[PDB]
Structure formats: structure tokens, C-alpha cells
Amino acid sequence: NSNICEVCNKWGRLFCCDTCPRSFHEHCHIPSVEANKNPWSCIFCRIKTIQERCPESQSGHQESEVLMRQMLPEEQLKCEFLLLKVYCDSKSCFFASEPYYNREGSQGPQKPMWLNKVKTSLNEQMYTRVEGFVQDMRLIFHNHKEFYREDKFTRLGIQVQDIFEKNFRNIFAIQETS
Ligand SMILES: [Zn+2]
Ligand SMILES: [Zn+2]
Ligand SMILES: [Zn+2]
Secondary structure, three states: OOOOEOOOOOOOOEEEOOOOOOEEEOOOOOOOOOOOOOOOOOHHHHHHHHHHHOHHHHOOEOHHHHHOOEOOHHHHHHHHHHHHHHHOOHHHHHHHOOOOOOOOOOOOOOOOOOHHHHHHHHHOOOOOEHHHHHHHHHHHHHHHHHHHOOOOOHHHHHHHHHHHHHHHHHHOOEOOOO
């Protein structure tokens, strides 16, 4: 197995996947690495299995259909993996914890949002459809763009949103377009 966490790229107390060479900190993995379970398979492995069991699940889909899906176990897992892929980028630090807003010439968002809040919401099964999760994720970046206005720091929202969107299209097999 790898000797660094797959998400944060640091050493520490790592839990190793039994079916692939990845390792994780307990709370870097999503869901948090399960107490017992030998063997243990990480979220990457669990996602690969879904695909292998139903190869047609990789055919293209319309976003509007994906968003209306109920959060059954496989969709819950896919949103967990998508959230994990965002944490995998170091720039996610900016969006992880609860923000505060006191900048001359700007007003804070009506509905603040952040990664750890989305993580808790998924853990608590608060989303009934994929749309709920995706709306909260996109709200993170939209709030950032609006608040930071013409400051060049707005770009960090564009950057992390692009990671989210690419991974959303991959994980949910959105039909490719120009
Ligand atoms: Zn980690
Ligand atoms: Zn694995
Ligand atoms: Zn099938």
C-alpha cells in the first residue's frame, strides 16, 4: 500500500485498502473508515465494482435525469466519492470550514455553505435526491464568486468548481457534449 493518505497526501495513522494500494486517514475517507471489516475495500474500489457489475451504467446520461435520482445506496456512494474527489484537491482547504464575510464593498451570502457541512449532511442522510447534494456543492462556489467580486481570489472558486464539475460528469457518466 501507499505510505501517504490518498486525499491529503500526508503520512500519519493510515488505514489500507485490501483491494487496491490506496491508504487513508480515518476522517479523510468518506464515509469515515469503518471500525471492523476485514477485508476492507475503499470508496474507489466500491465505485469500480458498481461499474463492473453494470457496464451499461457508463453510457451517457442527461444531467437533469441524474439530478432527480433518489439517494438510494448507489447514488449516496457516488455523491460521497464526488465530495471526496473535491477534498483531494489542496485548494479545497479554502472551502472546507465555515466561512465568514467582512470585506469593504461586499455583503455575505444569504445561504453560506461549505464542504464540511455537505459532508455532515451526507452522513446524516439529509439529501433525498442527488439534486440536493449538487445544489449545495455548486452554492459553495457561487457564493465565493459573488463575494470576492473582482478580487483575483475569485479564481479559487472557479478552479475548485472545475474539479467538482469534471468529476461529476465522470462519476455520473454524463453524456459528452461540445
Ligand atoms: Zn488524509
Ligand atoms: Zn481500494
Ligand atoms: Zn447491468
